[PDB]
Write a protein that binds this ligand. Structure first.
Ligand SMILES: Nc1ncnc2c1ncn2[C@@H]1O[C@H](COP(=O)(O)OP(=O)(O)O)[C@@H](O)[C@H]1O
Ligand SMILES: CC(C)n1c(=O)cc(N[C@@H](C)c2ccccc2)[nH]c1=O
Ligand SMILES: [Mg+2]
Lengths: 900, 50
């Protein structure tokens, strides 16, 4: 395609080549014979029908294997003309293998983005496409989903177009398991808004750096992904009424604070630690006392410490520049680096049992000395407060002696708390920058929740992240299948409810409700003598025979220490119950948090300033706040699917991909988009926006009800009338109409701005035409003047007398006429303008006389205002005096009651 | 859904049917009363032979 040239070098990695277009019309394919058949090692395989036997059919598969299956399980293949279409909602046959193979044929050619109607699927390339540099951003500016090939930039700009048109907050909702691609797409969204806002300054670069600044502190290599977001982020990009970037707000929901201290094999701790260590940058290796290699830091050495996908030498320099661009001063950047150094040393502190007190003490303190130096704390006071932390029971405080086994937990939780709040502050400081105080009204909230995960050992965090996915999956199910048809009934649309089975309310309720997991954690954390066995016991008694999704553990991998299994939407997940009570209760060492408030480092004091409310409670209320804030926004969804566990680009495992395609309800979502009415407009905004499509259908200057107006306009559009139905307050359209309406409107806006230019040039040329004619006519008069003189260069008596001045009455009396008139007219001007100026002053003095008198009256009125204000203050003070006497007697009597 | 300001950004609040009725009353009153005082101010803008 000749239009592909606009993407430059990125173009081959977004859309199929011209040869693939011509090959499609030449492929051998029979619609009646070509079908997909299920297989063991791979979910579906192409096959060829060879015979028909009534209710039983036999066919030969593409590998020459014989198969027999009943007709109820055979699905016709899509014709090659629809292969690799950019939007899977446009598939003719929609079933599990049609989506599987449609993703597989595109992904094997590195075309990683594909739409799925109202939402889009992105498949992890694992190898870069030069599809993310500055030049493509300009190609995506203002282009619509019908124009530009599928990409995360397309969704970002589409959301921006909606944000300005609807004057409503928008959302881009990226979802998927770990390693599927949500985070890199999030960055791409941020870089999109920044580059467009600068080309379409300091703030645009600052926002670009806002991602790698957080990503250094929040991302880690996992078994699923090298740069996994272990924290959910909601980034609100705010725009002014004029539409230019005005501010950006970062919000964070759940940092995997435990990851800071524990990682499984084949995964990293957060990137910040290894990127600082890898350059061995002398200024940082001097500021941070981390001159050694990363393989000795217990917290971060486990798993794998190096990954080929990340050039760890450069990421450090990228974060240093990121902080410089975001205006982090030397004290800020230095303090937060110092804090990471403290955290790194924090993992090496060793504790041992005292020979007689049965209490932990630090065996080595050099790492604590380094940490406290970096944090501006006292190493002795820190270790004393950790060794003898004080706990409170109401107002009374008592010292509890810590054992080694509980101090290791307490220090881990302390590391969690310091890291978590330092990340929060860094977020609030990024929201302190970017905030330009300029006009703000609308924002685009990009959501990148911590993905759905199945490790060999899943814990309470794995549940919180899965619950976060399950809630957004239930939100997607609700908006596409429940709320869609419910609003049809509310809007009175003649539609028949379809049950897709995509519901997770029962399993969410099993967690949220006052009998669910979270309420049990919320009460079991209160019991001082609760244990993992007491929790497991109450959990079982409450759910066995009472929950369909709660099941006995499988323990197929052995190790039956303590387990149960949960039927999430995305698969059976085995959870280990050990430690969930501690992880939820969040017992922080009150002494170390008090020292953090007392820190000599202004930053560490800021992190813990303004320090019952367990993490399950905070997360559940935060996520309900999020999803309520999100239901009040227009959502675009992005489904990230990981194609391969071995992280090999182009390699694709069909069963593992199908499992995610099933669980994210992509097939069901297409079923509703194709059958239902996904597009909807209020009759007033419809009239306001698309009146440009046919001003005669809605004549203004006369009243016409919103309903009948929309009826006439849409009837006038000459589009297929079977595509829409009318609600009580919104018009409703089939899947594919709204895009066509925006195409139609922008075609008309182009037509009109060019035709108004037809008028602008037409009358501007008229102005030029008339000015040229009048000026040249005056030039013709000037030509008559000179022609007249040559006519006068004839010899009459007058030629001698007129040119020279001897004639008395003609030259002298006309000179008197001209001189006298010159004097009179000049003074005439002066006199008329002066007389006017005197009148103008009189009119000014008359008005000033009225204003001066009214002001004289007004100063007396103001003195009355002063008397009013003074007596008001005086009576407020006297009443306060009596009110103080009242509270004096009351608080005294309350204290007397407390004494008695 | 009237817009109210919270810091530099505006937030949206949903109104009750009784309180939207009362707000439509208040809009009717304040448009009427301002229309009256403007009519007086226009009378005071004539009535002036300077
Ligand atoms: N669109 C992409 N382009 C290049 N690499 C990608 C892309 N998506 C995923 N990756 C691979 O995974 C990482 C980025 O994926 P990410 O979005 O962070 O996954 P998740 O959000 O699921 O953790 C990169 O380090 C790379 O290894
Ligand atoms: C249901 C949802 C997808 N939706 C629409 O279907 C249309 C909306 N607004 C109209 C006015 C519009 C159409 C196309 C682009 C921008 C705005 N809003 C919406 O929220
Ligand atoms: Mg991620």
């Amino acid at each position: 395609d000749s239009e592909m040239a606009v993407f430059g070098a990125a173009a081959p990695y977004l859309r199929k080549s011209e040869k693939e277009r011509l090959e499609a019309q030449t492929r051998p394919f029979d619609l009646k014979k070509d079908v997909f058949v299920p297989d063991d090692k791979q979910e579906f395989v192409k096959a060829k029908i060879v015979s028909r036997e009534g209710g039983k059919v036999t066919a030969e598969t593409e590998y020459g294997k014989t198969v027999t299956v009943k007709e109820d399980q055979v699905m016709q293949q899509n014709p090659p003309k629809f292969d690799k279409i950019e939007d899977m909602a446009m598939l003719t046959f929609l079933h599990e293998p049609a989506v599987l193979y449609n993703l597989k044929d595109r992904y094997g050619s590195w075309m990683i983005y594909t739409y799925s109607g109202l939402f889009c699927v992105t498949v992890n390339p694992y190898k870069w496409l030069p599809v993310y540099t500055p030049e493509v951003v300009a190609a995506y500016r203002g282009k619509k989903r019908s124009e530009a090939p599928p990409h995360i930039f397309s969704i970002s700009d589409n959301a921006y177009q909606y944000m300005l048109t609807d004057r409503e907050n928008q959302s881009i909702l990226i979802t998927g398991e770990s390693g599927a691609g949500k985070t890199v797409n999030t960055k791409r969204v941020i870089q999109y808004f920044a580059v467009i806002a600068a080309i379409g300054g300091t703030l645009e670069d600052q926002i670009i750096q806002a991602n790698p600044a957080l990503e250094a502190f929040g991302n880690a290599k996992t078994v699923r992904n090298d740069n996994s977001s272990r924290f959910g982020k909601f980034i609100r990009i705010h725009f002014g009424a004029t539409g230019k970037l005005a501010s950006a707000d970062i919000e964070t929901y759940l940092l995997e604070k435990s990851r800071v201290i524990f990682q499984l094999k084949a995964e990293r701790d957060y990137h910040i630690f290894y990127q600082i260590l890898s350059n061995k940058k002398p200024e940082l290796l001097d500021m941070l006392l981390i001159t050694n290699n990363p393989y000795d830091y217990a917290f971060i050495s486990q798993g794998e410490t190096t990954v080929a996908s990340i050039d760890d030498a450069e990421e450090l320099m990228a974060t240093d520049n990121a902080f410089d661009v975001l205006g982090f001063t030397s004290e800020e950047k230095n303090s937060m680096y110092k804090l990471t150094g403290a955290i790194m040393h924090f993992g090496n502190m060793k504790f041992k049992l005292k020979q007689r007190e049965e209490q932990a003490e630090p065996d080595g303190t050099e790492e604590a000395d380094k940490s406290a130096y970096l944090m501006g704390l006292n190493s002795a006071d820190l270790l004393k407060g950790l060794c003898h932390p004080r706990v409170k029971v109401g107002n009374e405080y008592v010292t509890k002696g810590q054992n080694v086994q509980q101090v290791i937990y307490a220090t881990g939780a302390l590391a969690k708390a310091v890291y978590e709040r330092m990340f929060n502050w860094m977020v609030t400081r990024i929201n302190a920058t970017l905030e330009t105080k300029q006009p703000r009204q609308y924002f685009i909230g990009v959501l990148d929740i911590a993905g759905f995960e199945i490790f060999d050992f899943n814990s309470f965090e794995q549940l919180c992240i899965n619950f976060t996915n399950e809630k957004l999956q239930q939100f997607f199910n609700h908006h596409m299948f429940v709320l869609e048809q419910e609003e049809y009934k509310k809007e009175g649309i003649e539609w028949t409810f379809i049950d897709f089975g995509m519901d997770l309310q029962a399993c969410i309720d099993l967690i949220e409700k006052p009998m669910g997991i979270m309420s049990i954690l919320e009460e079991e954390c209160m019991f001082p003598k609760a244990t993992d066995m007491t929790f497991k016991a109450k959990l079982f008694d409450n759910h066995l025979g009472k929950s369909a999704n709660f099941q006995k553990p499988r323990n197929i991998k052995g190790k039956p220490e303590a387990h149960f299994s949960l039927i999430h939407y995305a698969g059976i997940v085995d959870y280990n119950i050990i430690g969930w009570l501690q992880k939820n209760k969040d017992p922080l060492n009150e002494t170390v948090v008090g020292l953090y408030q007392k820190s000599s480092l202004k930053l560490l004091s800021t992190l813990f300033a303004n320090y019952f409310q367990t993490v399950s409670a905070l997360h559940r209320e935060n996520l309900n706040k999020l999803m309520t804030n999100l239901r009040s926004t227009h959502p675009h969804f992005v489904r990230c699917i990981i194609p391969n566990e071995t992280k090999s680009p182009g390699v694709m495992d069909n069963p593992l991909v199908m499992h995610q395609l099933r669980c994210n309800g992509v097939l069901e979502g297409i079923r509703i988009c194709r059958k239902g009415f996904p597009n909807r407009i209020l009759y007033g905004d419809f009239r306001q926006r698309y009146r440009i499509l046919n001003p005669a259908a809605i004549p203004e200057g006369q009243f016409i009800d919103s309903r009948k107006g929309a009826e006439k306009l849409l009837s006038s559009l000459d589009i297929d009338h079977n595509q829409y139905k009318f609600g009580h307050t919104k018009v409703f359209f089939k899947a594919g109409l709204l895009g066509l309406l925006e195409e139609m409107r922008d075609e008309r806006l182009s037509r009109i701005i060019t035709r108004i230019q037809a008028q602008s040039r037409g009358v501007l040329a008229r102005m030029e035409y008339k000015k040229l004619l009048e000026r040249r006519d005056s030039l013709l008069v000037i030509q008559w003047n000179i022609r007249a003189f040559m006519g006068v260069k004839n010899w009459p008596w007058m030629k001698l007398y007129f040119k020279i001045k001897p004639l008395l009455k003609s030259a002298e009396r006309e000179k008197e006429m001209a001189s006298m008139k010159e004097e009179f007219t000049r003074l005439k001007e002066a006199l008329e303008k002066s007389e006017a100026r005197r009148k103008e002053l009189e009119e000014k003095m008359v008005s000033l006389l009225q204003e001066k008198n009214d002001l004289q009256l007004q100063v007396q009125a103001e003195q009355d205002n002063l008397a009013d204000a003074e007596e008001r203050c005086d009576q407020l003070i006297k009443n306060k005096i009596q009110l103080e006497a009242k509270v004096k007697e009351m608080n005294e009597r309350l204290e007397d009651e407390e004494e008695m």
